[PDB]
């Protein structure tokens, strides 16, 4: 089997990128963000606290005649940005694309963060890392991806992601009209739970290329490019007025400005960042201050390649037995 589903930005600044999934029979279509850098499928519901819903669709399990409540099974993540959401589980019918899944363990909310709740245009996750980082408990669960593997075509999925425009997810096969050149893998380590790889190095703009090993994630679900403070200091000294702002949380820069491409790389291939896709428009509503769209990772931990990165590249999630992931230019 194969499934094929178009993703869409939602706003103008690429903040994240929502995909319909059908939930429950009959299908009741939720538009939820699919996120590589976590492994728990969850969804606003008939359970979740009123006051914490505001504008978004919402799955009634009471209503699907193929839901069944997971006894005992309680849920409760907490993401790199400081939002969280709980829960209990039903297990349902889910559908991306065309590709179905019976028996998969849906998420249902009951409680949600402010930023969840604020975010109207999104319904809740789907999660694509590896399914040992699932928050289900006692038991824990296996997300989309891992149940329907199996029966794929080929064990995989690609993330092709628009610059101010949609893309698509495509899972069990590689569509070889959707990139140029060649796809260049690369070494995957599950041991943290992420699609954990290393790039080879990076070039600002026309600059040579800076040979050094920069290992990080591969993640869907984070706007933005975390990198080390050196490589970000470097970036952002090539753009006059540019600095970090410890009120404003980040790099920011004149919004009159025009950006430097960065350039990262896989293997012995590179992947260019064009400089518009790292403008994040104004800091507030009228400035003319803008703020950047990579930034320093020494706060968090670990490098994140977010959208800013992933948006620029044709990317292979390879699930096969040593998992690995590949990269195109598009």
């Given at each position: 089997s194969t499934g094929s589903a178009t993703t869409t930005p939602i706003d103008s600044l690429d903040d994240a990128y929502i995909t319909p999934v059908q939930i429950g029979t009959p299908a009741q279509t939720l538009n939820l963000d699919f996120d590589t850098g976590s492994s728990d499928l969850w969804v606003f519901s008939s359970e979740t606290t009123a006051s914490e819903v505001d504008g978004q669709t919402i799955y009634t399990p009471s209503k699907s005649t193929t839901a069944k409540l997971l006894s005992g099974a309680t849920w409760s993540i907490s993401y790199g940005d400081g939002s969280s959401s709980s829960g209990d589980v039903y297990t349902d019918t889910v559908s991306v694309g065309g590709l179905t899944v019976t028996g998969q363990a849906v998420e249902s909310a009951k409680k949600v963060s402010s930023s969840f709740t604020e975010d109207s245009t999104i319904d809740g996750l789907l999660g694509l890392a590896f399914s040992t980082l699932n928050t289900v408990s006692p038991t824990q669960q296996k997300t989309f991806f891992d149940n329907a593997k199996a029966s794929l075509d080929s064990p995989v999925f690609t993330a092709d992601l628009g610059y101010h425009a949609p893309g698509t997810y495509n899972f069990g096969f590689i569509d070889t009209t959707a990139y140029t050149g060649s796809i260049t893998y690369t070494a995957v380590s599950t041991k943290q739970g992420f699609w954990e790889w290393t790039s080879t190095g990076y070039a600002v703009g026309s600059g040579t290329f800076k040979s050094t090993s920069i290992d990080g994630i591969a993640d869907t679900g984070t706007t933005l490019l975390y990198l080390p403070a050196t490589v970000v200091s470097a970036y952002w000294?090539?753009?006059?007025?540019a600095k970090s702002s410890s009120s404003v949380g980040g790099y920011v820069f004149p919004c009159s400005a025009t950006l430097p491409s960065f350039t990262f790389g896989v293997g012995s291939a590179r992947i260019v960042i064009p400089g518009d896709y790292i403008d994040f428009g104004p800091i507030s509503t009228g400035s003319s201050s803008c703020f950047g769209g990579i930034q320093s990772s020494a706060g968090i931990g670990i490098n994140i390649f977010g959208d800013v990165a992933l948006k620029a590249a044709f990317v292979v999630f390879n699930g096969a037995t040593t998992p690995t992931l590949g990269f195109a230019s598009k």
């Open positions: 000294a090539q753009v006059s007025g």
